[PDB]
Design a protein around this nucleic acid. Structure first.
Lengths: 122, 206, 37, 174
RNA sequence: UAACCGCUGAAAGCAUCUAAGCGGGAAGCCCGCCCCAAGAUGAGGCCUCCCACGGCGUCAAGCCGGUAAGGACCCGGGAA
RNA sequence: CUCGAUGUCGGCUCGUCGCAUCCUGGGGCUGAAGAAGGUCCCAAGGGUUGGGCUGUUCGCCCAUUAAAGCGGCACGCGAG
RNA sequence: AGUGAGGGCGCGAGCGAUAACGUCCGCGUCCGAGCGCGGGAACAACCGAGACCGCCAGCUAAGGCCCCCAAGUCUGGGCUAAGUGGUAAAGGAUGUGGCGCCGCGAAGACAGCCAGGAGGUUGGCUUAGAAGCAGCCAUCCUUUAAAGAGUGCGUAAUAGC
């Protein structure tokens, strides 16, 4: 569901759909890279070419596995942990990416692009 | 602004365009069992009861205390100040309107006797490089010539369940005038299928 | 302005004001707020 | 010799009562303080403050009872109106009845109320002030209003007593 | 009310917030918020109720029944 | 005083007071436009993060943060 | 026969930082070793005072007398009023009260007031401006409210206070 130190997944312009975040970008007292949140990290996994690198950005929270509990008592869980990498502003990293729909995301809102972008099966 | 009750159980419901969860308040309807007139108890107020547990069972005193303004045949009773009795019998079949905010409390389910572990926060000590106490145990208690001894009022092990308490604001959600019941989405303060009460205070400027 | 001390007035006509054992110099220039009580 | 001479014209209700001096004129039944030793008279047209000594306490007391009750009188004679001028591109003003129109906080609700001798005068409103009765409480309320926005040394847009020369300092660099 | 801002005013026959008297003012102080609490011998306040209980050397503040006025005991049950 | 006996570090866990207060606010001051800094007096209310390496508390460094204070109590804590 | 090492206080030299309930020596007292009573809150050595034993006797030290607790909430004359009492220096100040002193042209005072704030006062440099109120000094005259070689708000001098 969350974590501080983390081996997380992504799938943007990733070096590798994996980076380790330090912590949560929220109210100074992290403890939860939580669903639909924004946080900090560097790469863990490799990267053929790609302008990505073995650095560190911050970004926004996708999937989780341990209760995506929504306002409308909409409920879900994906046996997957990953978010999209950000470039400053938030403005996402890559041109596309491998994943899809569901409230929590769009709802957080700031990232419509991610929104229309990851649609279909997967 | 007060309701007397037999707290039922907590359960989930739906509102507007979304579900959320409530609780079951139930109260026949207490009545003017005793009044502190002010000249009577210048701490003026109303004391009432709200049900009835067997009559064959009942001390004379009770029988006549009732006699007083005479009412019925119960045992559930208690009091609250600064609350007029624009009646001589109360139910809530309106008494408590929904879509309103409330404050309320009740008996507090009865814990046990667990130290630094329970009672207080922070789950005990640590575990491994040390096991001659494995995982948790009691913090520290004072010192040499500081106060020169053992302190006097920091949290402490044991019995911390047989007590009572309340919750600040909560929502009145809904009113079922028939079976004198009300759904309120509440911290089920203390058990359920037992005793509670509600009162409303909050000149709270957001 | 203040200082647990000093104060020998200043603004050429800076006022020695007696207020609450409060050695407070009053003038016509903020520069002199002399609070030494 | 000097710190105690004043006449009580108008035949004002110039009298001393329960250890309090009662000065009654246009109505201002002003209560002018009476230190037990100060003492005073009002005969013919002459009203005098006496001095049961002349040391520090007393002498100041003299300057006072004299000046302040003198007040009691001049006051009871007219009605105490404080002349005041509101001025600033950023501000509005009208009596409204019994408050303080006022507007220069860019979220203008300024509904005030008139304490007592206080009558509101909007004849402008650039020129605009109040009338009171009680010289102390009047200068005061006036103040309350001034205070609530008035300041501005470097750029004006405030309320001003008579409106002192408002000393002003430059803004940026030029 | 803290610093800090003012009103009315002398002693310093012009002035000053300043002993005099009045006001402004801090997430802080008493309260308002919940939780204890007359073993606060300085309460108990109110309600109902058995009778002023019955025998003994007056000083009967001792005995026995007195009242199931009530409660305890044992039993049986309890998120206590 | 103590050698017929007082366990010294580092850390842990539970901490308790303190103000020369760090974040908090209240402020007069500015070389104060705004914003933002910086300059003192008032006030402890709550608050006063994770890791790295180093047995080191200090420290230097990563990432934030409103902020990530100094210190009293044998540099609190072995009858924990 | 016993101590053969002791400390404290005051004064006088060491030393030490002219620090320490430091340690060195000396004059004295001290305290132990009596120094058991008073006492100053209570405190081995700071002022009083030597206890052989009594008194339901009286005079006194020191130091005390509103009360807690014996003893005038004495009298008399002041001076502070901050609570100093109820630890502190450097140093700061129209604190408080006191000198022993200076201004009184009732040729009626000072803060408060009124009005004029006088004509050569007009470069000296700089004059873009000094024509007191821009920098290197000027130290004169007439003239009356008695006279500003102009103490001061200032820009372009100047003009106004």
């Amino acid at each position: 569901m969350i974590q501080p130190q983390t081996y997380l997944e992504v799938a943007d312009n990733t070096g590798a759909r994996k980076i380790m975040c330090i912590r949560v970008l929220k109210g100074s007292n992290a403890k939860y890279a939580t669903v639909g949140d924004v946080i900090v990290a560097s790469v863990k996994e490799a990267i053929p070419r790609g302008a990505v690198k073995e650095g560190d950005v911050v970004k926004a929270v996708v999937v989780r596995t341990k209760k995506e509990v929504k306002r409308p008592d909409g409920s879900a869980i994906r046996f997957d942990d990953n978010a999209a990498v950000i470039i400053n502003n938030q403005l996402e990293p890559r041109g596309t990416r491998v994943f899809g729909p569901v409230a929590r995301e769009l709802r957080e809102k700031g990232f419509m692009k991610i929104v229309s972008l990851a649609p279909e099966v997967l | 602004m007060k309701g007397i009750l037999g707290v039922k159980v907590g359960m989930t419901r739906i509102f507007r365009d979304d579900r959320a969860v409530p609780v079951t308040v139930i109260l026949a309807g207490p009545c003017p069992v005793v009044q502190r007139r002010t000249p009577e108890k210048d701490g003026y107020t109303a004391v009432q009861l709200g049900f009835l547990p067997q009559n064959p069972k009942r001390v004379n005193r009770p029988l006549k205390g009732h006699f007083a303004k005479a009412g019925v045949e119960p045992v559930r009773i208690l009091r609250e100040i600064r609350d007029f009795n624009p009646e001589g019998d109360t139910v809530t079949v309106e008494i408590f309107k929904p879509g309103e905010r409330v404050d309320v409390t009740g008996t507090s389910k009865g814990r046990g006797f667990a130290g630094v572990m329970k009672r207080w926060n922070f789950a005990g000590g640590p575990d491994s490089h040390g096991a001659h106490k494995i995982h948790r145990h009691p913090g520290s208690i004072g010192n040499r010539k500081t106060p020169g001894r053992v302190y006097k009022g920091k949290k402490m092990a044991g019995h911390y369940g047989a007590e009572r308490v309340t919750v600040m604001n909560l929502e009145v959600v809904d009113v079922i005038p028939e079976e004198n019941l009300l759904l309120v989405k509440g911290a089920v303060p203390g058990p359920n299928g037992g005793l509670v009460i509600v009162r409303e205070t909050k000149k709270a400027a957001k | 302005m203040k200082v647990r001390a000093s104060v020998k007035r200043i603004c050429d006509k800076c006022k020695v004001i007696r207020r609450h054992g409060r050695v407070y110099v009053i003038c016509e220039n903020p520069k002199h707020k002399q609070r030494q009580g | 010799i000097g710190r105690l001479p004043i006449p009580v014209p108008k035949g004002v209700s110039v009298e001393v009562a329960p250890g309090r001096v009662k000065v009654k004129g246009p109505k201002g039944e002003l209560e002018v303080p009476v230190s037990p030793e100060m003492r005073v008279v009002v005969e013919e047209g002459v009203v005098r403050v006496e001095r049961p000594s002349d040391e520090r306490r007393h002498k100041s007391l003299h300057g006072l009872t004299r000046t302040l009750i003198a007040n009691a009188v001049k006051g009871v004679s007219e009605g105490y109106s404080k002349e005041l001028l509101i001025k600033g591109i950023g501000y509005r003003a009208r009596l409204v009845g019994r408050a303080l129109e006022l507007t220069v906080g860019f979220s203008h609700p300024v509904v005030v109320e008139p304490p007592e001798g206080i009558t509101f005068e909007v004849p402008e409103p650039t020129r605009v002030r109040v009338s009171g009765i009680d010289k102390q409480k009047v200068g005061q309320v006036a103040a309350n209003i001034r205070a609530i926005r008035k300041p501005s040394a470097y750029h004006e847009k405030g309320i001003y007593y008579a409106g002192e020369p408002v000393r002003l300092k430059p803004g940026k660099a030029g």
